[PDB]
């Protein structure tokens, strides 16, 4: 796809299950495997118990190779650091 322009920018990479990987986009391929530097994963969880509120989890990862098979969406989160 047209992705070489997005190199070095901060991207929001969303998996099929809704996990959000936010990192600096450094590499990609035809399968959509991505290299995300200074990457964190965010999840938004809705508890089974209806009296409990949606909650969030953040994991600081680092240099991440994200597999393209699960990647469903990609949006610009911010300019390059």
């Amino acid at each position: 796809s047209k992705m070489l322009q997005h190199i070095d920018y901060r991207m929001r990479c969303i998996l099929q299950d809704g996990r959000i990987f936010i990192g600096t986009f450094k590499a990609f391929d035809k399968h959509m495997n991505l290299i995300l530097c200074d990457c964190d994963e965010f999840r938004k969880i809705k508890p089974k118990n209806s009296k409990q509120a949606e909650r969030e989890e953040k994991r600081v990862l680092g240099l991440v190779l994200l597999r393209g098979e699960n990647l469903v969406s990609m949006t610009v989160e911010g300019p390059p650091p």
């Binding site: 495997n33 994963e41 680092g62 190779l65």
Partner: protein, 72 residues
């Protein structure tokens, strides 16, 4: 470089591998193949229920990988 080249540069280093079903394999990447199948050694694994255990060697197929955490 291209993602696969980045993975090859981690050969000899400790990597973290998270599978599509939530298992976490952490250890020395001995060899990554073109399809991202990874041979790892002296690993620490965290299973889905949080059980932590160790294994001398594992072979994690790239099609089972959610993400890999590489050095640097």
């Amino acid at each position: 470089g291209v993602p696969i080249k980045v993975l090859h540069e981690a050969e000899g280093h400790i990597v973290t591998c998270e599978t599509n079903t939530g298992e976490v394999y952490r250890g020395k990447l001995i060899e990554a193949e073109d399809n991202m199948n990874c041979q790892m050694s002296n690993i620490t694994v965290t299973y889905r229920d949080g059980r932590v255990a160790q294994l001398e060697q594992v072979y994690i197929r790239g099609c089972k990988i959610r993400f890999l955490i590489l050095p640097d």
